[PDB]
Predict the 3D structure of the following.
Amino acid sequence: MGDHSQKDSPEDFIINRLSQALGIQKEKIKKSLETQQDDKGEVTNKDEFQGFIQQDNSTNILWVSGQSEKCTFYYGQLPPIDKFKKKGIAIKLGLHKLTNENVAKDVVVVLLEHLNSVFNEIMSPVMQNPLNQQGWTDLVAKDLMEKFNNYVAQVYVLLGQIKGKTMLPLPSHKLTSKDKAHVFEGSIITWTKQIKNVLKLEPEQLLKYGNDPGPLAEIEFWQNKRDNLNLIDSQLKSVEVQNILHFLKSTYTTPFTKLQAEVKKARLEANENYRYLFTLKDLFSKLQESQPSDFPTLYELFIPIMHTILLIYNKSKTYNQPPRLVVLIREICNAIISNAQAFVDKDTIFSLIDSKETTEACDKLQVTLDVCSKFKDAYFEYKAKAGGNWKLTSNALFVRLDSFLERCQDILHLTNTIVQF
Amino acid sequence: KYSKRIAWMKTTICDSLQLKDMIVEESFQYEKNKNLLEQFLSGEGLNKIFAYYQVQEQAQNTTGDLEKIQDKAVWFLRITNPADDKKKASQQDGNDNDIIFGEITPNTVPMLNALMESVYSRQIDHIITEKIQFWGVAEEEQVLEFQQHSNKFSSEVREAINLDYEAISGLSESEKMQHYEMKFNEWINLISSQLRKDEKDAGPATELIYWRSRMQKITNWSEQLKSKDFQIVKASLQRHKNHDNQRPRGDESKLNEAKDNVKYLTTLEKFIPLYNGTPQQIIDTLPALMNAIKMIHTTTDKMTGLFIKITNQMIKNCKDRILNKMIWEQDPAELIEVLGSCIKLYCEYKKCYNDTKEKVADMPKGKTSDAQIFGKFDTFVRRLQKLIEIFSNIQQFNALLEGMDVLTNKFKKIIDDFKKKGHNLLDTANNKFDRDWVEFNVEISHLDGELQN
């Protein structure tokens, strides 16, 4: 007889126990709550309905809109929720022996979904290792295993994206006894090299940003990724991996050459990263600013900051992309200047003009522009100090900074006239 | 192992009897293991070792055993515990340091695992519609996580779809071998049915749908053939030397070439108007379709059929867009602006047709249906152009001039009547359209005289 649309309730009351219960059958709280009409119908269909071996009980504890005793039959479970699923009459085995097949699994409240998918793939590989199947799997068994491996590689790539790459380690086959599987691992390795090439200083500059502190951080992040990739490559270059490359080999050679290029590019990136740390200290001397004063002191401080950059090119010497780095510098200076300019004017400038009782403030707006001129003057002075290889391209690179100054100058030209009226 | 060991013991005392029972009290087991001894050590490890993040509770058929190594057990139903972290936290509930799963011993796991994967995928989809979820690197990394989740969903769908001398003298019998041969011969007939129908006129979903259906159909047919019993029958026939069935099954079944064709159709479907309402969408649909059609180099007739279906869908979308843009009542100038957008789409189609013709010429040079399809495409392009011209005339009248405006309105009314007939019956539009063209020319002449005055 066992239990019907109550057999499962009773079993869960004993099994769930929170480490000390074994309650046996019916849950008083579920009956006492009497929720919900939709839930009663779903549960009734599960109980004596055919055709459907599933139900969830969701605990979900605290958080927001917790499922709690969820649960539903099929449907969905959200999030710290803790619930479970049981198998009854797994299409229909009902009206005869009480779903003897019923399978039970507990599910806590707490990516995790990706880890569960990897575990499912491992279970499928174990099943393939055990039996051959009853032909429902047929040959597709090995093909299904290959698809699971591809899904695992995709999950590894997702972890690298959220995480720091390492797609190649996920791509490499695990406990291989075929040749095609090794090729699939190699294809994943090629994608990792492409990702390093795709990242560039110019792309960040195109999408606004280009702050002096941000450029140094981007170089440091790129250097860290390259260092992690170099460490990953050591792990990636296993004895077994080398053997796969030997057994047909142009594709292996292209990734190996890409890895060597990354090791070089990576050394250049490390030099860039030391320069970036110096720039980051310069950015802190600007990021720290509370947007109060600063320009009357920053303008004086601009000449020494410019001088340190001049010295940085000489110390490195083998620094790759030196012309490209310059573009990053000018971008950092202009971006820092724009933030300072906005604080000086914005709502405060509009409030003053409306009151029309402040003149000294109008002079202060001109003083902020002077600070901008001093940075350009210091940059020019730095070029003379640099003696050749001026680079910079401020004419077009400095147009952004120049355009902001021109707009500010027009306001100053008009603001002065208003005082005269 | 962790001293908060009683928390795991209490939990197992409750769970084990439900999974490895029908409630009541499971025979005390963990205690047996702790007094050998092997079970006690393994449990200790499970609780405390960061390393072996897993532990298995395995129910075998009644006997119990606690050990991380997993052996399929039937008739067994089991609960597996896995501590994962190092040193069990005595200071927190044990149910909150373990995850529990009950596995079925030699019972349809291939379905329970699939259901669990589907639930995980649904939760991931909800998180994606929610906040961060993938976290980690995010942005690109989050997009990569979404792609991985989509792949997992596809795997779950695939799982749902999935859901010699051992006879002695029985081998050699004309009845036995003949029934085998007869069945295999009928199998060949049945496979031949799936491996000729003229394309004629079909909906965009139709062609795409039957190419996809050929993919999944021949796919399952190959699953049937790949089974060892189906092959074993052919092996028995080969042993009985009844080579008629074996050779006919290996060469007459068009599954090899037919299967390849089905795969090509599936690829075309993956690569790829009837859902457009605006003229912009008509043109955009034509653009996307023609870019999708570039995968050609990678049978000529099969490729041509797919292309024809796509072209038909685009034409239907364009007509709908024009309608969206009472023609006589509407001002000619206003009509022209709407008409112009439609006209631009038509021009693009004509350019595409010219490119197609060039490709056909190259094929002709190489070797000493497709032509008909090209002619049909040209006819479709011509029809679109005529509609555009009528719209343009109305616009010109509006630009002109009270008299000019009146002339434009009359032209619009005639166009509207033609459009209504087309909407009425799809067969009527085919037959109705031919009749309309003759009528339109007469109407145009009358309009021209008024314009001259």
Summary: Strands of chain B lie at 57-60, 63-66, 76-80, 101-105. The longest strand of chain B covers residues 76-80. The two ends of chain B are 106 Å apart (CA to CA).
